[PDB]
Structures are given as structure tokens and as C-alpha cells.
Amino acid sequence: FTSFVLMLLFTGIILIATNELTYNRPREIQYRYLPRDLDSFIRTQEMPSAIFSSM
Amino acid sequence: FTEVKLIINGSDRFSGRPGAYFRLVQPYEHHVRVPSKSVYVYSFALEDADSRQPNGSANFTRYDSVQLQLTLNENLASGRVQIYAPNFNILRIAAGMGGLAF
Amino acid sequence: LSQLVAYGAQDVYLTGNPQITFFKTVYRRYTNFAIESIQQTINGS
Amino acid sequence: TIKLMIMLFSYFAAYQLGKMQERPQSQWPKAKAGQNKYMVGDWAAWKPIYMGVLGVAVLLTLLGPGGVGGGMGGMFGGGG
Amino acid sequence: NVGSLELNNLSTAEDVATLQNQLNKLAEEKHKRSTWKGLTFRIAVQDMWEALTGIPTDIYQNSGRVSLKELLTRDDRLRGLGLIFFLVAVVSIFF
Amino acid sequence: LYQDPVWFQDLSVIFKRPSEIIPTRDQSDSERINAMVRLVLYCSFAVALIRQNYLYAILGLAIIAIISLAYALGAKKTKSNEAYGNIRPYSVKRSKKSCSKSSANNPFSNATVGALLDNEARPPACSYDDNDMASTMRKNFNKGLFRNLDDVYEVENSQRQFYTMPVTTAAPDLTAFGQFLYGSKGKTCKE
Q1: Which end of chain B has the smaller Cβ count within 10 Å, N or C?
Q2: What three-state secondary structure class fits E8?
Q3: Chains in contact with A, where contact requires at least 3 CB pairs less than 8 Å apart
């Protein structure tokens, strides 16, 4: 009787250790500097055309 | 004053002494200058004029009753006895906030 | 106006800064708008 | 005793028609006519809480990019 | 040619910092990958630390008034219940 | 503005505070799932105690997981439980009334032109204190705005002028207003 639940937990905890890898799901995006000429062009321009963007 | 005595919680802090002691001797011993004018003082600390370092203090926050007895001369006009008592506090400054702690 | 700003590839990779000859003006392409003038109602003598 | 114990719960499960719960919406306050009760905050007491609140506001401002400027300059940092 | 604005980096960053934005977010990527790699199947000895973090904090989670199941178990705690494997191995050795 | 009592779903630890509810009645779907959880837990634990094999509790927990997972995944998003006007025929059971939560583009959900954008029929922006939307509103207002750090009860950057308009839908819902002033009184004397 006791050995049954002991083996049940024995396999179940290995199953849990396998399961746990799925939890963390972060997004990866990198940052890079503008080209110098393009940066100067963007800084110089006076009107923005489209108003705003959130991404 | 011909005689001065401080009483703390009903008891003598010091034996009463002649006014001359308080005018001439006390500041000689405890302060920078003797006033030469009839100013009477008494210290609870040794040797100072602030001196940028405590040299003792009396914590009157624990004195439930303080009285001082003056034996006055017989040629005084009615009027004021202005009593001052310079003391210590803690200035506390943190995270943009000031104030003085009791 | 105070939010951090960055460009995507479409505004960097697929473009660039053209060199402009003093004497060749390149005019900016712009939004479509029109101007009208109307009278407002005044409340009060 | 399996058949019986399950039915005991079944009989009780049916019966408790109704649903007790925590008070909904908003809690409410009572106002003395102005005699006989202690104010919620000491009037001298109220100003300090003002002052206490500031501790938090200032701490937030120790990181400029994380919030609102202070009384001079600015400061930088970040987390991890 | 167009202005696109990123609102936050999991913590609102006002448009004042210039390189702090790159440093912070690079640290964010490094932390995310470190957690991912130390949180996947490949672990060497970190199971002991995860178990020792799991038990007291799992118990304390109910010492708050509530604690969401998405947080009582998934807050780096799921393999933290890996000590049950150790204990069942011990008792199976006994029993 | 329409208000409902408080409930919660089987997550956290609510399944013990209002304990000893087993089967559903006049309860929200989350509350009904909670009651089913209570039924299964008590039944399986009692069965395990009667027959000490230590596995009926395991099966009870497994079927708890099955029921909770089914409720979590199989929910149908096609809900339009919006109350306004004279009729609310979609459902008469306990449910959470729809709210138009504050957004970055519309911090106060004033429905200036957001109604014509995508919603067409926009649920009312519910009360200032209903679901902690006061904190979200303050956070959205203080997005990209710098304070002088001389006001910890911030009024300096003009909070007061901004507010939620009395109506936040395309229509003022005049029927509800009229029913407020003029009760139906059901069957009257003239009838």
C-alpha cells in the first residue's frame, strides 16, 4: 500500500522535473546604434509623418 | 541676588550659594569670559561655550518639578527675571526631509 | 514626448541617407489637409 | 462505510442552499457629532503621515529613468 | 524615417537615459538566458538549492492571505518539489 | 453603474475560507467550479480515510486538475454581458459585468472617439473603485510626465481637471435614467 504511493511519487517527481522547464518564456530583442549618416538625417528632419508608435 | 539655589524634584541640586558665586566664579570656571555685569549663571557641564563637543548635560526631561530659589536684595524694582536655558536636540535629515527631534 | 525611441530595420536597412546637391531641392511629401475660416458665436453683449 | 459517507456529503451538499461571502463594494465610516471619540488620526499626527509618504516618493526618485526628477541634477542606475 | 517608441523594459524607463537603456536590457537578456539554462533539464547540483528555496517559501506562500497557484508552484518552485524524488528514493531504500 | 458582490475562482486559497459549500446554486461560474472542487476534495479525502490505500486522494486531486483545466481552457470568449437600457436578457445568473478598462490611448475611458474606432458598442467604464482601476488610471496618467517632487498628493500636474465623464457609452442610456426618476411600480392602481 505505502510502496504504491511511494513509487507513484517516485515517477511523478521525475515527471515534474521534466515539466518545469516550460515555465520561463522571455522575449529576446537586441539593441543597435543607428548608422551615423542615417542618425544625422533623422535628427535633422523636422516633421515626423506618422504621429507615434508603441513598438 | 544675594543667594541662589536650584531645586530638582524637591531636592537641592547644590547647596545654596551667594549670588557673587554665580556672577563671577561660575563663568570664570566654565565659560570663555566673565561678564563683569550682574549676570548670574549655573552650568551642568564642564568648561564650555558650546566648544563643539558636549561636556555634560542635565536631562530635565526627567525632572517633574524644577524650581529655583532666589533671595533677592532689598533694593530691587519690580520686574523681570529672564531665565534662559540653552539645551541639546538632534537635527535629523533624510531623503530630502528635515526637522528637529526632541 | 518623453518615451524612449528606437527604429526598426524597415527604417534603417531598407533605407538610408541620400546625398543632396545644394541645387536639387527634394520637397517633402506630406499629409492631406485643408484650411477653412468660420465665425464663432459670441455669448454676451 | 463508503456508500454512506459519500451520501452524507451528498445530503449536506444539496441542503446548504445559499452562498455566504465577504462584504462587497465599499466599506463605510461613521462620524461623531464632535464629542466623545478619538479622531482617526491625530491632527498633529496627520502632518507626519504626509511626511512619511514622502520617504516613499523620494526613494522612487533615486532612479531618474524610473520616475520623476528631484530638486537638482539627476541620477542614474538600474536593476538586475 | 518613422518614430517607434518602446514604453518600458518590464520597468517603466522615462526617455532620459540613453545608454542605461542598452545596459539594463542587456542585463535583462543575460538574466533571462541564465534563468532559462539553469532552469531547464540540464542541472548539475542546483537541485539542493532549489529544494531549500522551495520548502520554506512554499510553506510561507500560504502564510500570506492568498497565493495564486500560478505563483505558489511556478515561481521557480516546480522542480523545487524535486526533493520528493530524494525522499521516495530514501524510503524505497528503507521499504 | 452596476455593482455585483465579490467572488473568486479556485486558484489561490479561497477554497478554504468560505468552506463547506459543495454543490452549485445561484452562484457565478467560478463559484460553481469552486463548489465542485469542494465536493471532489471532501469526497475523495473521505473515501481515502475509509479505505486507507492513499491513492483515492491522488485520484481526487487528478480529477480536480481535470475539472479546473477544462474550465480554464474551454471558456467561450463569446460573451456580451453588457447591462444597459431596459432589458438584460443574455443571462440572469451571477456574472461579472463588462467593464471597459482604462487604456494607454484613453487613460480615463471617456469614449471620445474610441467608440467609433473598433468597439461600436462600448461597455461603460465602471466605477472608480470597482477593480483597483484607480491605480491603473494614475499609472496611465503618469506615463511620460515628470513631477517636481514638491507634491506627494499630486495635484500640481492637474489631476483634477481630468476625470471620467458621467456617460462612457455611445448613448446616454436614457431608459435607465427615466426608470431611475420614474419607477415602473409594476401593476399600478389603474391596471
Answers
A1: C
A2: strand
A3: C, E, F
